[PDB]
Amino acid sequence: MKTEWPELVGKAVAAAKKVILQDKPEAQIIVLPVGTIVTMEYRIDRVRLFVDKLDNIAQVPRVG
Numbered sequence: 743m744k745t746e747w748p749e750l751v752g753k754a755v756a757a758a759k760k761v762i763l764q765d766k767p768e769a770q771i772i773v774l775p776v777g778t779i780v781t782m783e784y785r786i787d788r789v790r791l792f793v794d795k796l797d798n799i800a801q802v803p804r805v806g
Contacts, residue, residue: 745805753799755791762789762803769805776800 744765750758755773762769769789774780776792784806792801 747803750799750803751801755793755797758791758799758803766805
């Protein structure tokens, strides 16, 4: 199980989702501004996308 997509740093949301969904078709994908404070719960279904003000992936997307 691949759980990180470092290769998507700097990509637009639309482009990113396309790759993630190929790897994890039933992923729950949430978009948040980078810097948003999140909790430590581990959600195996989830992949959070932290984006910058240009709407590009700012941090390595990972399952959690």
